[PDB]
Amino acid sequence: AALEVLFQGPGQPGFCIKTNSSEGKVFINICHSPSIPPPADVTEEELLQMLEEDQAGFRIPMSLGEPHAELDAKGQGCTAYDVAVNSDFYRRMQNSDFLRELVITIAREGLEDKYNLQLNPEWRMMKNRPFMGS
């Protein structure tokens, strides 16, 4: 459901999602920029029905950044990927847990497809960091 656009990141830091592959820790930096087009403007109700009809029916424009190696708060190596969405859409995500978690799934699956990874679906929001890296 990710519609990939090429965007040399990062935009503005947003929030940071911790997951992992079979080989190590992976962080998804959800960022935003006015450069990234928004998805179609729909209500939460209309969105729910689209997912019933197509698991990937709601296409979201986003960048899928190249991996960069970083050190976590404990000084250990990890991978970060910068994933940027539209700024106005990001504000909408801030006000909807359902919308935010949908976008996180689409970003995770987008990265899985692009980099041939299996990423743990049991992700967690980082509380001490909006962004892994500089």
User: How far is it, in rounded angstroms, from Cα 23 to Cα 20?
Assistant: 8
User: How far is it, in rounded angstroms, from Cα 130 to Cα 61?
Assistant: 21
DSSP for residue 65: P
Q: What angle do CA 121, 104, 60 make, to 5 degrees?
A: 135
Q: At what resolution in Å was this solved? A: 1.6
115: left (phi over 0), alpha (psi -120 to 50) or beta: alpha
Which technique was used to obtain these atomic coordinates?
Answer: X-ray
